[PDB]
Write a protein that holds these residues in place. Sequence first.
Motif, PDB file in Angstrom:
ATOM      1  N   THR A  53       0.801  -1.217   0.000  1.00 39.82           N
ATOM      2  CA  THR A  53       0.000   0.000   0.000  1.00 39.82           C
ATOM      3  C   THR A  53       0.835   1.269   0.000  1.00 39.82           C
ATOM      4  O   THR A  53       0.448   2.260  -0.610  1.00 39.82           O
ATOM      5  N   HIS A  59       5.706   7.772  -9.893  1.00 39.08           N
ATOM      6  CA  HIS A  59       6.456   9.018 -10.029  1.00 39.08           C
ATOM      7  C   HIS A  59       5.732   9.960 -11.006  1.00 39.08           C
ATOM      8  O   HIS A  59       5.275   9.542 -12.069  1.00 39.08           O
ATOM      9  N   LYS A  88       2.180  -0.910  -8.200  1.00 37.91           N
ATOM     10  CA  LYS A  88       1.862  -0.017  -9.311  1.00 37.91           C
ATOM     11  C   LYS A  88       0.954  -0.459 -10.454  1.00 37.91           C
ATOM     12  O   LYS A  88       0.474   0.383 -11.212  1.00 37.91           O
ATOM     13  N   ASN A 110      -4.450   4.869   0.854  1.00 42.97           N
ATOM     14  CA  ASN A 110      -3.858   3.851   1.696  1.00 42.97           C
ATOM     15  C   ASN A 110      -4.822   3.272   2.710  1.00 42.97           C
ATOM     16  O   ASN A 110      -4.508   2.274   3.356  1.00 42.97           O
TER      17      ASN A 110
HETATM   18  N1  LIG Z   1      10.525  -2.908   1.108  1.00 40.13           N
HETATM   19  C1  LIG Z   1      11.067  -1.773   0.674  1.00 40.13           C
HETATM   20  O1  LIG Z   1      11.830  -1.052   1.361  1.00 40.13           O
HETATM   21  C2  LIG Z   1      10.852  -1.227  -0.631  1.00 40.13           C
HETATM   22  C3  LIG Z   1      11.380  -0.169  -0.988  1.00 40.13           C
HETATM   23  N2  LIG Z   1      11.127   0.261  -2.205  1.00 40.13           N
HETATM   24  C4  LIG Z   1      11.805   1.452  -2.495  1.00 40.13           C
HETATM   25  O2  LIG Z   1      10.923   2.399  -2.973  1.00 40.13           O
HETATM   26  C5  LIG Z   1      11.734   3.515  -3.454  1.00 40.13           C
HETATM   27  C6  LIG Z   1      10.951   4.245  -4.512  1.00 40.13           C
HETATM   28  O3  LIG Z   1       9.850   3.369  -4.834  1.00 40.13           O
HETATM   29  P1  LIG Z   1       8.738   3.667  -5.893  1.00 40.13           P
HETATM   30  O4  LIG Z   1       7.420   3.842  -5.148  1.00 40.13           O
HETATM   31  O5  LIG Z   1       8.687   2.708  -6.895  1.00 40.13           O
HETATM   32  O6  LIG Z   1       9.431   5.160  -6.349  1.00 40.13           O
HETATM   33  P2  LIG Z   1       9.154   6.045  -7.605  1.00 40.13           P
HETATM   34  O7  LIG Z   1      10.494   6.395  -8.297  1.00 40.13           O
HETATM   35  O8  LIG Z   1       8.271   5.257  -8.567  1.00 40.13           O
HETATM   36  O9  LIG Z   1       8.506   7.259  -6.969  1.00 40.13           O
HETATM   37  C7  LIG Z   1       7.245   7.189  -6.314  1.00 40.13           C
HETATM   38  C8  LIG Z   1       7.393   8.082  -5.095  1.00 40.13           C
HETATM   39  O10 LIG Z   1       6.124   8.092  -4.363  1.00 40.13           O
HETATM   40  C9  LIG Z   1       6.296   7.584  -3.083  1.00 40.13           C
HETATM   41  N3  LIG Z   1       5.128   6.806  -2.816  1.00 40.13           N
HETATM   42  C10 LIG Z   1       4.543   5.818  -3.564  1.00 40.13           C
HETATM   43  N4  LIG Z   1       3.435   5.313  -2.992  1.00 40.13           N
HETATM   44  C11 LIG Z   1       3.334   6.037  -1.816  1.00 40.13           C
HETATM   45  C12 LIG Z   1       2.391   5.991  -0.771  1.00 40.13           C
HETATM   46  N5  LIG Z   1       1.351   5.162  -0.771  1.00 40.13           N
HETATM   47  N6  LIG Z   1       2.580   6.851   0.265  1.00 40.13           N
HETATM   48  C13 LIG Z   1       3.668   7.689   0.212  1.00 40.13           C
HETATM   49  N7  LIG Z   1       4.582   7.793  -0.717  1.00 40.13           N
HETATM   50  C14 LIG Z   1       4.370   6.947  -1.703  1.00 40.13           C
HETATM   51  C15 LIG Z   1       7.556   6.750  -3.150  1.00 40.13           C
HETATM   52  O11 LIG Z   1       8.118   6.547  -1.835  1.00 40.13           O
HETATM   53  C16 LIG Z   1       8.447   7.579  -4.103  1.00 40.13           C
HETATM   54  O12 LIG Z   1       9.168   8.712  -3.540  1.00 40.13           O
HETATM   55  C17 LIG Z   1      13.032   2.856  -3.954  1.00 40.13           C
HETATM   56  O13 LIG Z   1      14.250   3.545  -3.585  1.00 40.13           O
HETATM   57  C18 LIG Z   1      12.907   1.375  -3.460  1.00 40.13           C
HETATM   58  O14 LIG Z   1      14.132   0.960  -2.825  1.00 40.13           O
HETATM   59  C19 LIG Z   1      10.297  -0.352  -3.204  1.00 40.13           C
HETATM   60  C20 LIG Z   1       9.729  -1.529  -2.766  1.00 40.13           C
HETATM   61  C21 LIG Z   1       9.922  -2.099  -1.477  1.00 40.13           C
END
Ligand SMILES: NC(=O)C1=CN([C@@H]2O[C@H](COP(=O)(O)OP(=O)(O)OC[C@H]3O[C@@H](n4cnc5c(N)ncnc54)[C@H](O)[C@@H]3O)[C@@H](O)[C@H]2O)C=CC1
Lengths: 142, 426, 426
Positions: free
Chosen positions: C108, C114, C167, C189
């Motif tokens: 969620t 982005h 996504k 969420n």
């Molecule tokens: N288990 C984990 O720690 C995971 C971490 N990630 C991390 O996520 C980071 C960016 O992920 P993407 O979402 O694909 O980035 P993205 O480059 O596609 O940017 C989307 C942005 O929106 C934010 N976002 C997305 N859904 C959100 C929500 N429901 N509430 C608040 N913020 C939200 C993200 O944190 C990010 O800054 C990466 O650096 C990756 O390492 C991704 C999957 C699992």
Amino acid sequence: PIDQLATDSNYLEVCYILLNGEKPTQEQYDEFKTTVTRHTMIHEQITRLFHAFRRDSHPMAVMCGITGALAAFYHDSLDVNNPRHREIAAFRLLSKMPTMAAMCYKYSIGQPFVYPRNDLSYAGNFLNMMFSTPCEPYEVNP
Amino acid sequence: ADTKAKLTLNGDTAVELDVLKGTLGQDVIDIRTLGSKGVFTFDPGFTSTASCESKITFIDGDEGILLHRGFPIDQLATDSNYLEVCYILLNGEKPTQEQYDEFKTTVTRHTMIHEQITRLFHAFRRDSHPMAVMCGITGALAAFYHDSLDVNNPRHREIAAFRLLSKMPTMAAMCYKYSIGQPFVYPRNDLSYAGNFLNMMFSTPCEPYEVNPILERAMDRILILHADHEQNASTSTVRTAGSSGANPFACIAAGIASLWGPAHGGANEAALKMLEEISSVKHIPEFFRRAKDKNDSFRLMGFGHRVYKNYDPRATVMRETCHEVLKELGTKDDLLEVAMELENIALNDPYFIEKKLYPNVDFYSGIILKAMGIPSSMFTVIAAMARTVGWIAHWSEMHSDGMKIARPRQLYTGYEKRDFKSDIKR
Amino acid sequence: ADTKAKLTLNGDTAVELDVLKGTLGQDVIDIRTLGSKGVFTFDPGFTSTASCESKITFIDGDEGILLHRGFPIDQLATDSNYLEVCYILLNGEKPTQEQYDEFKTTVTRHTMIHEQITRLFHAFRRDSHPMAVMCGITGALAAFYHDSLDVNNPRHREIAAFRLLSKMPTMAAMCYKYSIGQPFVYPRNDLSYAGNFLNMMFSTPCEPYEVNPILERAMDRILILHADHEQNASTSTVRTAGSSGANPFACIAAGIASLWGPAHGGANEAALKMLEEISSVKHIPEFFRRAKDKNDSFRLMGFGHRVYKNYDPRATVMRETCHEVLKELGTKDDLLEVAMELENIALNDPYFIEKKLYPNVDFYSGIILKAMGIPSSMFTVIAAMARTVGWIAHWSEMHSDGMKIARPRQLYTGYEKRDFKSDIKR
Ligand SMILES: NC(=O)C1=CN([C@@H]2O[C@H](COP(=O)(O)OP(=O)(O)OC[C@H]3O[C@@H](n4cnc5c(N)ncnc54)[C@H](O)[C@@H]3O)[C@@H](O)[C@H]2O)C=CC1
Ligand SMILES: NC(=O)C1=CN([C@@H]2O[C@H](COP(=O)(O)OP(=O)(O)OC[C@H]3O[C@@H](n4cnc5c(N)ncnc54)[C@H](O)[C@@H]3O)[C@@H](O)[C@H]2O)C=CC1
Ligand SMILES: NC(=O)C1=CN([C@@H]2O[C@H](COP(=O)(O)OP(=O)(O)OC[C@H]3O[C@@H](n4cnc5c(N)ncnc54)[C@H](O)[C@@H]3O)[C@@H](O)[C@H]2O)C=CC1
């Protein structure tokens, strides 16, 4: 008679005659032709209107759209009572219409717009704006 | 020609398997009936399985043979030109002058892409790796070319072929102009396929661009030499994805992605780690970095190749080509004196002699492109850009044969039927 | 316990082969090292060739048996949710309360895309197909997510896998919103995977949207029934693509293009031709159109399926859920009473009983999706969205096995070597 005009004259001279009531002297023709030519390129911001229409929009609809949007850009020739304003409003439409028409076509087919060309005639230019691309030299059949 | 007739499989009942033969290469055991007889083989990797019948490319890895429609890759690269090879691959026969005129005029006639598609490049970040943008663009074509998606209409295939064949180098040179903040260049009918790609790649609105004939032919050669390469990974993905109705624009996109998979799929610093250690141990002008780099060797670096044993046949005419390019550019390539050193290393280092890390067509292509100014980010875009016809032909053939949908088997080895009882409560 | 011992292939002498055994279904004949002798097997389509050993999904066509990690499809389709089923496909076991909640949470919290990706939608045409555009955004993701392409890194693979399960709905819903012309809606969420989806599909700023509990549940089950389906073509396209080392996104983009392959691959008028004949022969309120349409019958309309013999084990719950939905939307779905006549025809009309045109999961899933106000175009999209978790699991299981690059052979029947002589000049 419409026959003689279409066989002996040319659009711009007819343009001259309709608006002025009399046929143009060579000197007056030069003057009038140079004014239509001198204002064919439209404002680039207006050019940005075509890009707000869907690629699938019927060209005519886009045309009415474009033409109905000119007043926003040509706000200094809207006083239907100022003689000088009418002269501008006439020349603009007369010069930019075929330009907006050939753009409505290039748009609806995903081809780049063509800028007017002073060396070309009114018809030959419209043909050029209508068909030519940046890929090859366009031949205007007489 | 010993048993080009029949053989037998012994599971429980002697099943007669007919041996099939080609005109070149090895024989194949037709087992297309085993499955029904409840008999499945197990070949993850299809290393011992022939996925289809093909008449396009033939490779003899041990003897270094590569033929396109029966013609040796050497002659084609030296005597022919990309478009004629394009004609030959797709049609199976060489073109008459009249048929060549016809074909060349069709590719030329459709180079400019839809302006709306041109608006896709502008939605990508200026910092996006060109290849990624390419897969992005190519995976977006189906939305715009919705009238050539019926993989079954013969006329649709002809359009889908010509489009890709004509617009690919156009989308490749735009992926480059974009990533460097330079305006895109429209195709030019007066220019050749290679010369035009060179023009779209480098020229600006500021000055008249000079297309060096040496570079023109060189580039062309890179294209003929990267046209097709039998049933490799990318060509397999294209076929597999294709046998499942996928539109031509999608198959090529997975072929492109399948092609640079080994690139990014190594590590953010696999063949890039030591490319960072060139600032601390730069005391030695070679064994620092990419002389000491390969702890985990790569053919991506231009060394060796699983298909050929002692050498890569495509590298022969690529090496010769690479000689003129460097001798043409002169005082801009004297620093690029490492190509020799690197070649010497591969030819003499016991490790390189040992594991056969000989120079391949890419070694010699990399140098050519590097001498030309094209960045490393573009190398793969240009490989795939040339490789498109090879994907199309293979795609086409697959649809003429019978388009046998990809439905392989599996050896299940997971749980047996078990009951589910909501462990959680949310 | 029959031929669980061994077997032998005879060409002109004996060649003994192993026979690996699975916990369920058919065993196989180990032919991996056959190639290390030159002996190959011919099998276009691999319907008699086990492409891999899996543990994710087990099927038995004739028995109508579908299993995901051993748990029967009917058990999951009722007593679980999409995420809990996703956790199982991805992790092999039903989650624990603490496991599920953490898996759920991360899903969620990563639902937004982005802002620069959102921009790319705007360069596509409005008249484009939500599915053609769905492919475009999917294979375009790699241009942004350059931080998770390296497939040999378990960290990357997981991040990438989560980037897609989070996504896909967001992406899909936007395809719909952009196609109709309503503004894009951000994920909430506070809503479940499915509710949050119906909101992004049907929400508008003009008023707050309120998800009907039965409809929300109904969508979760549509997702559940499409979660995975073993080694089909569109999943085998992901596997083939992934073997090369291609990034996850481009692999997930290949499957989408291969999942609707039969939809567009039909023709501009395949299952659409007679849809135009509903204006001249409308004298009869059923046999006009899609009662007479199928000359070339389609399993895409909900009748028939290659996998099962007599019925779809996924169609069970989907049918029950179908009634609840229609038994909720009341006075708007009474006109969609063709669903029962069509079903009636499917059960009694000879034409159907002959070709065994039984109503599958898609048959009922469609009636629900149509009942819910969803446009046809967005049906394989939703199916591709649900099936992604499967493609994720398959691609992931292939990345542990040994990531075997699909390098098949070919029965070459083309031209033997022939000299090349070009007779052209252009
Ligand atoms: N288990 C984990 O720690 C995971 C971490 N990630 C991390 O996520 C980071 C960016 O992920 P993407 O979402 O694909 O980035 P993205 O480059 O596609 O940017 C989307 C942005 O929106 C934010 N976002 C997305 N859904 C959100 C929500 N429901 N509430 C608040 N913020 C939200 C993200 O944190 C990010 O800054 C990466 O650096 C990756 O390492 C991704 C999957 C699992
Ligand atoms: N008879 C006359 O004296 C006329 C005078 N005008 C005057 O000329 C000005 C022209 O306004 P618009 O053309 O409507 O301006 P605009 O900004 O709306 O559109 C085109 C712009 O491009 C220039 N342009 C147009 N066609 C051209 C061509 N073929 N070659 C070179 N430059 C070209 C124009 O000067 C103008 O700045 C008016 O503001 C008005 O004062 C307009 C009509 C008749
Ligand atoms: N062998 C054949 O007859 C083929 C016919 N076609 C047909 O031609 C049409 C072309 O479609 P696309 O090129 O994909 O259109 P598009 O709109 O998607 O992209 C380019 C547009 O620019 C024009 N164009 C492209 N390159 C050009 C060039 N070098 N010089 C001048 N104009 C150029 C095209 O005619 C087209 O309208 C198709 O719709 C199809 O009907 C396409 C391929 C082969």
